[PDB]
């Protein structure tokens, strides 16, 4: 797929992703906070269409993500991210996509997710997260 | 006069300031690095004009500031930063301004300056620096 | 069980845990690095005995953990950590324990684990990790 690396920021204001229950996560885009200003991250688009759009608008800075979890697995022979769930100190958003495959979870006791990087072809192949105080 | 706070970034690519030999430092602006790309900082300008502009272009990422120093003293009734000096691992830029008054110096043994905050009226009244690994 | 919190240090020199092939992880103790010198952490022991002790001696500072993973599952009605595996830039230690239940994994792309906290009763019920540059 096509690799992407948004880099690190001050925080997260909104996450715009898309998914398909038959397959996996598709698009991924983030509006981060940059020293008080919204920073519109680039839209990392799936090579294909047919996804269901999801907008997660956080009440920043009061609301912040406390855990990101999901599932990885094979779709058309590719090991990808089939599902994602974002839990904040206020609400749980998701799961988006089918909860099948190998689970994974990143609960955060102290600190903040401040960036995302990864790779997207037809679906989200993999991703990592920038963490900071 | 007007408080400013650029916040934190990934590094420093360029510093653009102005000064006047009769007085003190006037305008201050920074081009930061933000995750590998130039981010043009807000230009913090003096309420008056007639200053000499200077550009400090750093060979980012190999060159980085290791020490900042200068002088603070009275100028027509205000105690402001009258002079600034930036020493990188490669060379020294400045003194710019008037080296009179009481000195100050911030040597950095490990870490980086990643942002600037402060206040400018007719001149630079004061400033602080964001430090990070 | 008894909760523990080692706090943060400057790195890890050794991990000493115990496990039982029929149940789960039992004891857990870390020899941390504290500013270039070993710091012997508190030994967090199970309320029972009969486990198999294991020692993981790292070639610090060149060798360091890059991924921690394992399994959580049921043992006599308690959800606990049944298996752990530490993978460094040089080798894999483990799995220690029963690799059955729900998997979890924490790969680290940049940064270091510098502390542990959690709770141990008859077995390791849960744990968290301090991360730092």
């Amino acid at each position: 797929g096509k690799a992407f690396d948004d880099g690190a920021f001050t925080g997260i204001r909104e996450i715009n992703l898309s998914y398909n229950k038959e397959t996996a996560i598709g698009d991924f885009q983030v509006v981060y906070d940059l020293n008080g200003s919204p920073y519109v991250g680039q839209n990392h688009k799936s090579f294909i269409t047919g996804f269901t759009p999801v907008k997660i608008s956080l009440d920043f800075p009061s609301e912040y993500i406390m855990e990101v979890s999901g599932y990885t697995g094979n779709v058309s022979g590719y090991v990808v991210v089939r599902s994602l769930t974002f839990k904040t100190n206020k609400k749980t958003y998701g799961p988006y996509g089918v909860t099948s495959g190998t689970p994974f979870n990143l609960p955060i006791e102290n600190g903040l997710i401040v960036g995302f990087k990864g790779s997207i072809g037809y679906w989200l192949d993999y991703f990592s997260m920038y963490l900071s105080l | 006069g007007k408080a400013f706070d650029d916040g934190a970034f990934t590094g420093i690519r360029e510093i653009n300031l102005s000064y006047n030999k009769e007085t003190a430092i006037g305008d201050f602006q920074v081009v930061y690095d933000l995750n590998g790309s130039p981010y043009v900082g807000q230009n913090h300008k003096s309420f008056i004009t007639g200053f000499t502009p200077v550009k400090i272009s750093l060979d980012f990422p190999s060159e980085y500031i290791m020490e900042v120093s200068g002088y603070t003293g009275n100028v027509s009734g205000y105690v402001v930063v009258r002079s600034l000096t930036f020493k990188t691992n490669k060379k020294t830029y400045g003194p710019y301004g008037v080296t009179s008054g009481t000195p100050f110096n911030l040597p950095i043994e490990n870490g980086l300056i990643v942002g600037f905050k402060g206040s400018i009226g007719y001149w630079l009244d004061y400033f602080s620096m964001y430090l990070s690994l | 069980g008894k909760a523990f919190d080692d706090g943060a240090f400057t790195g890890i020199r050794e991990i000493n845990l115990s496990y039982n092939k029929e149940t789960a992880i039992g004891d857990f103790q870390v020899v941390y690095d504290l500013n270039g010198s070993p710091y012997v952490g508190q030994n967090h022991k199970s309320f029972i005995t009969g486990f198999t002790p294991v020692k993981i001696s790292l070639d610090f500072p060149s060798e360091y953990i890059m991924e921690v993973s394992g399994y959580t599952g049921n043992v006599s009605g308690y959800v606990v950590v049944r298996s752990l595996t530490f993978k460094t830039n040089k080798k894999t230690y483990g799995p220690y324990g029963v690799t059955s239940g729900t998997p979890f994994n924490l790969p680290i792309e940049n940064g270091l684990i510098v502390g542990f906290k959690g709770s141990i009763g008859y077995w390791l019920d849960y744990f968290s990790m301090y991360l730092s540059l």
């Binding site: 690190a8 999901g70 990885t72 590719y78 090991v79 990808v80 991210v81 994974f104 990143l106 401040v114 960036g115 990087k117 990864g118 790779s119 989200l124 192949d125 993999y126 991703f127 990592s128 997260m129 920038y130 963490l131 900071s132 | 934190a8 970034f9 990934t10 590094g11 420093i12 690095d33 750093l58 980012f60 990422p61 190999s62 060159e63 980085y64 980086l112 990643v114 990070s132 690994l133 | 994994n105 924490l106 790969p107 680290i108 792309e109 940049n110 940064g111 991360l131 730092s132 540059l133």
Partner: peptide, 15 residues
């Protein structure tokens, strides 16, 4: 270096 660093966890997915 002149570049500020940040802790990064993952990746989760392929590779």
């Amino acid at each position: 270096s002149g570049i500020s660093q940040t802790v990064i966890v993952g990746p989760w997915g392929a590779k």
